[PDB]
Design a protein around this ligand. Structure first.
Ligand SMILES: O=C(CSc1nc2nccnc2c(=O)n1CCc1ccccc1)Nc1nccs1
Length: 822
C-alpha cells in the first residue's frame, strides 16, 4: 500500500530526471562509447585512416597534446587550408573498437595510447565524422516520450509511546522444514548506522500451529526499551528466523523493516515482510492509533563558526589525528577530543569522516549541531566522500551531502569505482535516494557507466535480502537506457548464455569427446552470429560479427575454460580473443584486478609508471564470466619446463631472449620485467596474495609480469616471505649472476610504490569496506580490513617503511639473498 506508492513516487522522479537528458543533446546522448582516459600528471607515432586516401597518414604526435589539435594535425596533412573542412564535425576513433577519443583530453591520457606504449604496438586511429560513426545505442524521441516501467498528526520527538509490535506468524513453510525442525523462534534487533541501539530481543520457541503445518504462530508482543522519540529516522528492525532441530539452532532467513517509511511516517498496523529461502510471508503487527506519527528533523540552527581562541599545547595532538591515515583504530579519548575541537578542523575538509565517527551519539537533540557544521563545511574530495556512503553513516543529510560532493568526480574515474557504489545502495533504506539518482544520471550521460551498472546490478540480484531492491534499480536503468541500449544488452545476455552452455558442456565430456563437443556446441553460437552481430560484454567497443570456430579451443586446466575467438565486424580492427570460464566466482578476481588497477592509477598520478598489465574480467552470472586474454604470454611454469628441457638458472632469461634477440630488445624486456615485477611484489604484499607460484604468475613476451589467479586474497594470515623472487627472476633484474645497479632500481621502485599506496591507506580501506556486503569469502569482517591496514603500516614514516619493504625483498630472495648487500 505504501511500498507500491514508494515505487510510484520513484518512477515519477525518474521520469523528471529523464527530462534533463533529451535525445537531441549529443553531449549526454552520443550513441557511442567514449575511449577511457586516466589523467597522468614524450612522442608517439599514430596511424590515422582518412577517407579518400589509400594509405593512412602516419606522423609523430606530442603525447601531451590534446586530441582536438591531433584531429586538425591530421587535417593539415590532407588539406593545405582547413578553413572550409568543418574541423568540428570530425572525431577520432580507435581502429576496430567502436570507442571515440575525447577531444579535450591529451592523447597520453587515453588508456588505449598508454597500453600501446607499454606493449610497443602501433596506435591505429580513424579520422571520421560523427555522421559515419555508428550511433545505434543512441536514445530516440520515442524513448524520451516513453514512461518508466520498473489524519491528525503527532511529531516523533513528542511521541513517548514505547516501540513495540507483536510478531504474529510466518506463512508457507516447506515440507523439509516440518521434517527437520521441531520449533522456531525470531531474534529481533533494532539498529542505526549499521549498529545495534539495544541488545536483540528473542521470541518464544514455538512449533508449527495445530492442524496447519504451513504456519508458525507466535502472536507474542515484543517491547524494546526505547520510545518513538528516541528512534533516529533511518532506524531499521531486523528479524532473523531460527529453527531448533529435532532429536546450535540454524538461521533460516532474515527480514528488515524500516520503522519510518519514505514519507517519514512511523509504521502502523499490520506489515507483511517476505524472507526468501521459496517465499515465506512473516506478519508483524505494529500499534495502530487514530493519529499518524511523522518524523520531523531538528529545527535548523543557523551559525557560521569564525575566528576562535587558539592554543598551541593541544593543536599538535589535533593535527596529529587530522593527518592520521584513517578513522580506523581511533580510540575513545581521541574521538572526544576531535569532537570538542571539531570547529578548528574547518580548514581540512577531508577529515569530516573522522569527525562524524567521533560523534557521541545521533540523538535528536545533538543533530542540529551536526547539521549546522555539515551545511557550513567545505567540499570534500569525491574519493574521501565515499566513506560517508558506508554502513556507519545512515543519516540522509550526511549521505545526500556526500553525493553532492561526489558530483565533482569524472565519469572516467567513477567507471572503475562502480562495484562499490552498487554495494553502497544496500545502506540506502529508501528506494529513491540521492545515490541511485546520481548513478542513473551518470548512466544516462555515459554509455560505459550504463553498461557497467547493468552487469553489476544483474549480479547483485542474487542477494536474497536485497534482490528486491536491485530489481527496481535495474528496471529503472534498463527503462531509462532506451530501446537502443536494451536491445544490445539482450544480445550480450544471449551470447553469454550460449557461451555458458558450451562451457559446461565441454567440462562434462571425456578427452576424445571434448574437442568434438566444442565444435558441435559452437554451432548454436554460429547460429546466433548469423542472425545478430553482438558487442563483446567484456569490452563493448568490440563488435563481433562471426565466430572463428576453427580457432576456438579450451585451455587444459581444472575448470576447462574456453578460448572464444571471434572475427571483428570492423575490417580495420583485429580478431577478438576472450576466455569464458564456468564454475569459479570471478567477483573476487574482479576485486583483485580493480585494487591493482587503482594502485596503478595512484602510481601514475604521482609520475611512477611500473608498466603494469591491466586486463579485464567480467562476471556474467553466478560463478561464470569472461576474462581478457593477454597475447604472447605464458605462465612461469611452462617457461621453466620448456627451457629446463634445454640453462636452469636462466629459463626466463632465455625465454625473453627468444622473442627479444637484439641487445636493446633484451634490455627493454629486462627493464619491463623490473618495473612490472616491482608493482606485482608491492600488490602481492598489500592485498596479501600468498598463493603466488609458477602457475599463478604469468609473463608477456615483451617482458611484463602479471598475476592471473586471485583465489587467495586478503589472506594476511602469513607466518614470519610474502612474495618470492627466484634466481631466474633475479638474473633478469640484475642482467647477470652478480648484483648490478638495476637491482637497486628494482628496490627503489618497490619502496617508492609501497609508500605511494601507504599514502592512500584510507581509499583502499574504504574500497574494501564497501565490498564486505558482497559476500566475497575472505572479505566478511572489519577485522579483515585491519590486516590490510597493518600491511600498510600508517603509523611509520616513509623512511622506516622503505627499510621494512627492503627487508621483505631480502627475505623474498631467501637462500640466494646472501649474494646481495644489506
Ligand atoms: O596467449 C594467451 C595467454 S594464456 C592465459 N592468459 C591470460 N591472460 C590474462 C588472464 N588470464 C590468462 C590465463 O589464464 N591464461 C591461461 C593460463 C593457462 C596457461 C596454460 C594452461 C592452462 C591455463 N592468450 C591468447 N591471446 C591470443 C590467443 S591466445
Amino acid at each position: 500500500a505504501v511500498q507500491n506508492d514508494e515505487v510510484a513516487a520513484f518512477c515519477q522522479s525518474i521520469m523528471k530526471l529523464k527530462t534533463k537528458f533529451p535525445y537531441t543533446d549529443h553531449c549526454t546522448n552520443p550513441g557511442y562509447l567514449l575511449s577511457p582516459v586516466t589523467v597522468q600528471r614524450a612522442s608517439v607515432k599514430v596511424s590515422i585512416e582518412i577517407e579518400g586516401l589509400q594509405l593512412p597518414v602516419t606522423f609523430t604526435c606530442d603525447v601531451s597534446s590534446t586530441v582536438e589539435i591531433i584531429i586538425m594535425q591530421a587535417l593539415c596533412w590532407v588539406h593545405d587550408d582547413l578553413n572550409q573542412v568543418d574541423v568540428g564535425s570530425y572525431i577520432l576513433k580507435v581502429c576496430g573498437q567502436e570507442e571515440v577519443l575525447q577531444n579535450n583530453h591529451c592523447l597520453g591520457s587515453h588508456e588505449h595510447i598508454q597500453n600501446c606504449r607499454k606493449w610497443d604496438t602501433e596506435i591505429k586511429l580513424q579520422l571520421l565524422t560523427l555522421s559515419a560513426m555508428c550511433q545505434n545505442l543512441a536514445r530516440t524521441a520515442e524513448d524520451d516520450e516513453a514512461p518508466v516501467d520498473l489524519r491528525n498528526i503527532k511529531e516523533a520527538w513528542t511521541a513517548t509511546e514505547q516501540l513495540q509490535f507483536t510478531v504474529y506468524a510466518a506463512h508457507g513453510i516447506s515440507s523439509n522444514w516440518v521434517s527437520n525442525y521441531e520449533k522456531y523462534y525470531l531474534i529481533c534487533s533494532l539498529s542505526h548506522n549499521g549498529k545495534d541501539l539495544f541488545k536483540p530481543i528473542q521470541s518464544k520457541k514455538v512449533g508449527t500451529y495445530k492442524n496447519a503445518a504451513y504456519l508458525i504462530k507466535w502472536d507474542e508482543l515484543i517491547i524494546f526499551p526505547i520510545q518513538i522519540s528516541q528512534l533516529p529516522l533511518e532506524s531499521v528492525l531486523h528479524l532473523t528466523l531460527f529453527g531448533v532441530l529435532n532429536q546450535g539452532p540454524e538461521a533460516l532467513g532474515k527480514v528488515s523493516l524500516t520503522l519510518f517509511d519514505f514519507k517519514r511516517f512511523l509504521t502502523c498496523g499490520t506489515k507483511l515482510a517476505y524472507l526468501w529461502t521459496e517465499r515465506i510471508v512473516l506478519q508483524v503487527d505494529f500499534p495502530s492509533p487514530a493519529f499518524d506519527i511523522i518524523y520531523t528533523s531538528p529545527q535548523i540552527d543557523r551559525n557560521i563558526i569564525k575566528l576562535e581562541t587558539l592554543e598551541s599545547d593541544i593543536k599538535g595532538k589535533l593535527l596529529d589525528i587530522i593527518h592520521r591515515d584513517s578513522s580506523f583504530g581511533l580510540s575513545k579519548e581521541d574521538k572526544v577530543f576531535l569532537w570538542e575541537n571539531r570547529y578548528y578542523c574547518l580548514k581540512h575538509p577531508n577529515c569530516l569522516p573522522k569527525i562524524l565517527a567521533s560523534a557521541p551519539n545521533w540523538k535528536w537533540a545533538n543533530l542540529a549541531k551536526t547539521y549546522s557544521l555539515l551545511h557550513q563545511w567545505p567540499p570534500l574530495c569525491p574519493l574521501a566522500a565515499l566513506e560517508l556512503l558506508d554502513a556507519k553513516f545512515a543519516d540522509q543529510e550526511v549521505r545526500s551531502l556526500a553525493v553532492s560532493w561526489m558530483e565533482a568526480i569524472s565519469d572516467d574515474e567513477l567507471a572503475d569505482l562502480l562495484p562499490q557504489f552498487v554495494q553502497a545502495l544496500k545502506y540506502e533504506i529508501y528506494l529513491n535516494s540521492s545515490l541511485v539518482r546520481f548513478l542513473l544520471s551518470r548512466a544516462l550521460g555515459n554509455i560505459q557507466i550504463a553498461h557497467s551498472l547493468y552487469w553489476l546490478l544483474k549480479d547483485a540480484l542474487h542477494d536474497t535480502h536485497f534482490g528486491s531492491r536491485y530489481e527496481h534499480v535495474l528496471g529503472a536503468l534498463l527503462s531509462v537506457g532506451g530501446k537502443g541500449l536494451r536491445e544490445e544488452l539482450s544480445k550480450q545476455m544471449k551470447l553469454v548464455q550460449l557461451l555458458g552452455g558450451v562451457a559446461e558442456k565441454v567440462r562434462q565430456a571425456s578427452g576424445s569427446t571434448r574437442q568434438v563437443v566444442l565444435q558441435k556446441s559452437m554451432e548454436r553460437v554460429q547460429s546466433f552470429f548469423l542472425r545478430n552481430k553482438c558487442r563483446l560484454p567484456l569490452k563493448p567497443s568490440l563488435v563481433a560479427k562471426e565466430l572463428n570456430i576453427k580457432s576456438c579451443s579450451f585451455f587444459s586446466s581444472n575448470a576447462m575454460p574456453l578460448k572464444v575467438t571471434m572475427v571483428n565486424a570492423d575490417p580495420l580492427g583485429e580478431e577478438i580473443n576472450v576466455m569464458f570460464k564456468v564454475g569459479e566466482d570471478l567477483r573476487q578476481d574482479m576485486l583483485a584486478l580493480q585494487m591493482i588497477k587503482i594502485m596503478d592509477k595512484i602510481w601514475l598520478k604521482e609520475g611512477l609508471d611500473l608498466r603494469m598489465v591491466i586486463f579485464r574480467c567480467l562476471s556474467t552470472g553466478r560463478d561464470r564470466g569472461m576474462v581478457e586474454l593477454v597475447p604472447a604470454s605464458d605462465t612461469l611454469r611452462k617457461i621453466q619446463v620448456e627451457y629446463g628441457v634445454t640453462f636452469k638458472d636462466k629459463p626466463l632469461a632465455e625465454w625473453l631472449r627468444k622473442y627479444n634477440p637484439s641487445e636493446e630488445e633484451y634490455e627493454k624486456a629486462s627493464e619491463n620485467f623490473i618495473y612490472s615485477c616491482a608493482g606485482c611484489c608491492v600488490a602481492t604484499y598489500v592485498l596479501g596474495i600468498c598463493d603466488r607460484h609458477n602457475d599463478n604468475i604469468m609473463l608477456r613476451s615483451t617482458g611484463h609480469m602479471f598475476h592471473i589467479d586471485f583465489g587467495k586474497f586478503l589472506g594476511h594470515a602469513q607466518m614470519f616471505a610474502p612474495f618470492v623472487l627466484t634466481s631466474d627472476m633475479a638474473y633478469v633484474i640484475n642482467g647477470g649472476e652478480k648484483p648490478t645497479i638495476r637491482f637497486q632500481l628494482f628496490v627503489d621502485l618497490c619502496c617508492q610504490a609501497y609508500n605511494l599506496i601507504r599514502k592512500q591507506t584510507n581509499l583502499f580501506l574504504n574500497l574494501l569496506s564497501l565490498m564486505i556486503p558482497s559476500g566475497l569469502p575472505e572479505l566478511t569482517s572489519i577485522q579483515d580490513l585491519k590486516y590490510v591496514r597493518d600491511a600498510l603500516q600508517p603509523q611509520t614514516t616513509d623512511a622506516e617503511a622503505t627499510i621494512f619493504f627492503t627487508r621483505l625483498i631480502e627475505s623474498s630472495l631467501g637462500s640466494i639473498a646472501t649474494k646481495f648487500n644489506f
